[PDB]
Amino acid sequence: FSVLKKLGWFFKAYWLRYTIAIVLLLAVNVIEMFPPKLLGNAIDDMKAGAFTAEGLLFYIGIFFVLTAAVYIMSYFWMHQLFGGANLMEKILRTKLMGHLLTMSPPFYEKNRTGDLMARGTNDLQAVSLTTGFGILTLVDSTMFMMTIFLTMGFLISWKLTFAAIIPLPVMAIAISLYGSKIHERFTEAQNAFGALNDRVLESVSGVRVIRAYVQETNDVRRFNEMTADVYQKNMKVAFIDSLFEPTVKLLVGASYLIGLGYGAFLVFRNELTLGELVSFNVYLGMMIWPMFAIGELINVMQRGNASLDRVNETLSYETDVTDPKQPADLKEPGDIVFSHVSFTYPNLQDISFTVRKGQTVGIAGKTGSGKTTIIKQLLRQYPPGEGSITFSGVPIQQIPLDRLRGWIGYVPQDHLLFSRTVKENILYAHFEKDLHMLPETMVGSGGQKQRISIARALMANPEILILDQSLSAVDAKTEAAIIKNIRENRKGKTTFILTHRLSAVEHADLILVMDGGVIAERGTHQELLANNGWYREQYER
Amino acid sequence: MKIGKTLWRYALLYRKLLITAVLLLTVAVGAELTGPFIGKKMIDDHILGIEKTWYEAAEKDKNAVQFHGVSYVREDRLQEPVSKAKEAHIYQVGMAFYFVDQAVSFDGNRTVSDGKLTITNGDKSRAYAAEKLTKQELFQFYQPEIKGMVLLIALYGGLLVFSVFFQYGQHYLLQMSANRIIQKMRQDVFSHIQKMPIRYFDNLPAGKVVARITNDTEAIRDLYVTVLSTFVTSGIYMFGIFTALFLLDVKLAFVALAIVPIIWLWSVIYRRYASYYNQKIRSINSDINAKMNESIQGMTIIQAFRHQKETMREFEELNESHFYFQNRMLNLNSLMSHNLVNVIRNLAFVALIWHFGGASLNAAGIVSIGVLYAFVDYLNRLFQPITGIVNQFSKLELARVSAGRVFELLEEKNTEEAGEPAKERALGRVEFRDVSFAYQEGEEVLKHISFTAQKGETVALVGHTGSGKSSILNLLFRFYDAQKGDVLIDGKSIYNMSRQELRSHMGIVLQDPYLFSGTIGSNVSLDDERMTEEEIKNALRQVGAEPLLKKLPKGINEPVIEKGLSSGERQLISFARALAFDPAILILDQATAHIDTETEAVIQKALDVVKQGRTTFVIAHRLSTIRNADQILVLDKGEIVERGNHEELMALEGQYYQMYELQ
Ligand SMILES: CCCCCCCC/C=C/CCCCCCCC(=O)O[C@@H](COC(=O)CCCCCCCCCCCCCCC)COP(=O)([O-])OCC[N+](C)(C)C
Ligand SMILES: CCCCCCCC/C=C\CCCCCCCC(=O)O[C@@H](COC(=O)CCCCCCCCCCCCCCC)COP(=O)([O-])OCC[N+](C)(C)C
Ligand SMILES: Nc1ncnc2c1ncn2[C@@H]1O[C@H](COP(=O)(O)OP(=O)(O)OP(=O)(O)O)[C@@H](O)[C@H]1O
Ligand SMILES: Nc1ncnc2c1ncn2[C@@H]1O[C@H](COP(=O)(O)OP(=O)(O)OP(=O)(O)O)[C@@H](O)[C@H]1O
């Protein structure tokens, strides 16, 4: 529970490899205390009279088998405990972007894409590192410390141990204090380097102006100043950084010297042997890692608590409507009737219009007036407003999402292509000629890509085809030919043409001119001629 | 060209710091390594000195130990040598220590039955009496050494503190060295970037160049830190430790020296496999990021199509391979790293035990546990940095390629050599003569563009896209060379002067007002450092309303803390800069495809202020706000289709009529 379960669900279903790993790790922890004591015993047996070839052969055999045992147990348990990290990384990626897809864009695409892309790498790495490395540090800093402490407090002495151990708490606290400031002074270097990067980018984008007014030497003078500041920050950080190795060297040599001097003193009182001295020194040698492991543990367990709160907020707290409501549904979308719709973005005010099966309709208007809000709501990507959008008679919400999106064939004004080849963008229109032109090559000409979007939307063979300013890039003749061809092919199918040009969105079936926050009128092309002075055929030869 | 050669040539600079660091590190390593040698002496000569023969002597007082009877003195501590005198020993059996008051002819297996110590070793040299050393007696035989125990200890202590300083300094010094080299590097790079043809930045994005300036030089910084703080330090620590081992013992030193080939083969194969296993995760994570980014801004389209659930397919096709190679890297780590370190460490314990037992107690003697302890400490020190060594050796290649990139940038010879400004106002008499400019090869873009703009300003260049309107600006500032024809200013060939001189006559107000981050006053001045009060005057003359809102634009006012405000105010600042710099010739590469409402009105109010009293080139496409131009020129096909006044083209119809007919 709390910080335990927050990651524990991962190996709650994987307890086998996250418990065998712990067991093998503790077995290695205990077994690793043998080689030093065996070496000390070999020394003491050499010193005494009793020593034969059998003891030597026995000692080399036991050392070999202990080596092989530790080598296999590590190669297996650490393999499991880091394959677990790999699997947790793979799980967190999958779950994060699965939430991404199974969502809508009303308030999420509002949220900065920078945060969303930074999560999926930074925080995934942070949490996976928690699970693996933080657990390893916990094991080697809560037990390995206590195990070695007691191995030297029961098998060597309870006097030499405390003496040779007193400096290590000081070492750990000094390491923590140094880390408390190196990070504080690392922000300075990183952000000054960022400022130099910003200035270099600003000087490299505006090269034409810089060289136009012959200021490049000033620029070089400005670039050198910032480089000097970056160097100065790096020095203010290296000053502290160079205090790490000296302090560990000092407080490990002090440990070794206390051990050796006090051990010789005790031996002079016949409380140890020499083999015990060698074994205790080997123990001191093997006790270095936990002192850094404790710091790594605390760092990771302090970082993860927030680096996982982030993922939790961008994975679970998100509660929006991306799914439909009641089984209620209309198998056929032929007719579309609006009723007092007041859709708003996360716009419309008392809008009402009608469409019918096999009706090529067009909509136009001015700028700043709801024109995308009409079809955008029909795509179910933003919260619904007042009124009703019924395909036959019932509210919009009951319409299923899968069937709805399958019916719509949409071409967006802000066109976007994903697949790297046009063939896959169409497997996802007058382009038979574009094939015999400059470009199935690759994606990522605006008009050509709009044509690709048109072909892709048409390939659905849909029943409600929405075109949103999809003909503003091509010529008037080209768009006229496109609309004529689609109307002839899709004679018995509905269309919702939308474009700034008031030529292909009036005479098809009807024009719903939108002005301000309400409708100007619901007439047709012929009625549009006799109406308020507006963008009529005067502005188009 | 070799990367290493230039890296060494760059390191030779700031060589004083490098030599100081190397020598400080060498002395610190020696001082530290001398510690385990002190421990060996302090064990063998003091703790294990009791084994040496003892002689009956109350003469050398203050160091002659007292048994229950007469007092004794060590062999080598015999200040008044008496030669044989009375031979005595203190032997060790199990835990007990036994005093033998008689000469012994052999050493070997020691057995005690009833106070009669027996040493035979298969020879039965003799049977000797013995007396248990009790507890106080054993301590009395240990007191003479206590002083030495303390003394050497202090020595150890001393050196430690000493080494600490000699360990700090060097590292710090190394840091400076590397950093300073990078600084040098960066400077040179940037200098060479200011000698680069505009083609360089035309055929390359800004991100690439900035990365080649800063991020690559940071990679080179890390390369220098890797080479110095890891390879040099590790090599020095290996040389010192091996020397100490060779001083201690030879054959065991030959065994220890037999590990360098082991590290060589370990590193070779680890790199050979880690190259695979790390390239094939860096590339795959790049693919992962590309897929995730290409499928997030299309949340409105991916949702409304048949791919909200098909992305998973090809992704996981990539992701399973990513995780598979992650696990392969984990396997390679498992068969190496700390694991092989511990395997070798246990093999070293085995080597120590085998050698000592088989060569010392097979002959029943010549055992030095001080040498054992020193070897143990030395090999513990040795086996620390192997993992870092192999890791850095594997990592070196990316730094190698980044350094190669920066060297290629620093090395190419196609650069522009100039820097000389002018000393007069040209009066804007720019002339052209059958310029035939070709961009890549053979595909000419300008066809004998010949004309002569007089001091009368506003020679507007309004024409067709893909014609050469921007080529005119590029050749005017010599951003490119025409490769034919000629261009002149007051009869002076453009291709026989200096670029800085040429651009010192002409300014520009580009369609995209560059608002360099900082203060507005410096922005308009472009940090000139040669105008003090004219900037505010030439700004207020046209944008006098803007300061009325908040503070003073020259007075470090900061509406430009986001790389700016209103686009009109953005183009107005550009105009103010162009006026303050006050060139003779003036080019307006104005491209307003989407005019921002009526804000352009004041913009026109600004243009008339600046265009006057100059030789202005207005590369516009409105053909309505420039109806007072002294010479309209229309450009299509790369050749001057038509030229004339604002009215002389209306009479002749032509391309100008065609465009102005789309009024
Ligand atoms: C000494 C004190 C006195 C009390 C002693 C009481 C016993 C103390 C024992 C303590 C040991 C630790 C127990 C851990 C919790 C058990 C459940 C568990 O581990 O789940 C595991 C499987 O489920 C099992 O392992 C059940 C095993 C026992 C019941 C099955 C019959 C075997 C009887 C054996 C004979 C002995 C018992 C005979 C009983 C008549 C894994 O499931 P999960 O992955 O976690 O899925 C749920 C969570 N999730 C959905 C998020 C994934
Ligand atoms: C208190 C303790 C004080 C200690 C002394 C403090 C001294 C003052 C501190 C800073 C050093 C200042 C050096 C100034 C150099 C001036 C230029 C010159 O002519 O000299 C030449 C030096 O080498 C020779 O003079 C030998 C003759 C040239 C043969 C080619 C070099 C052979 C390298 C073998 C020489 C031994 C190699 C040693 C390797 C570790 C320059 O040769 P280089 O090729 O251009 O660069 C070599 C750089 N290196 C020497 C670092 C490799
Ligand atoms: N993504 C959006 N989020 C919030 N409000 C929006 C969004 N897109 C448009 N609006 C607002 O919708 C109101 C109605 O006009 P809208 O901008 O939707 O259509 P339009 O610009 O006339 O049409 P088109 O997008 O086809 O050019 C405008 O005031 C605009 O502020
Ligand atoms: N970086 C370049 N490398 C090669 N050719 C180029 C480059 N930039 C432009 N050109 C070529 O220069 C010729 C004219 O381009 P220019 O930019 O001068 O046109 P423009 O008349 O200003 O057009 P626009 O209406 O887009 O402003 C065309 O052949 C174009 O392909």
Author numbering:
A (entry chain C): 2 to 347, 353 to 434, 451 to 461, 465 to 469, 476 to 572
B (entry chain D): 1 to 564, 567 to 665
Article, verbatim:
In the same dataset, we also detected IF conformations in 2D classification and 3D models. Heterogeneous refinement implemented in CryoSPARC42 was helpful in resolving the anisotropy problem of the maps for the IF and OC structures.
BmrCD is a heterodimer consisting of two protomers: BmrC and BmrD. Incorporated in giant unilamellar vesicles, BmrCD can transport ethidium bromide in vitro, a process powered by ATP and inhibited by orthovanadate. Finally, a distinct feature of BmrCD sequence is the presence of an extracellular domain (ECD) that caps the TMD.
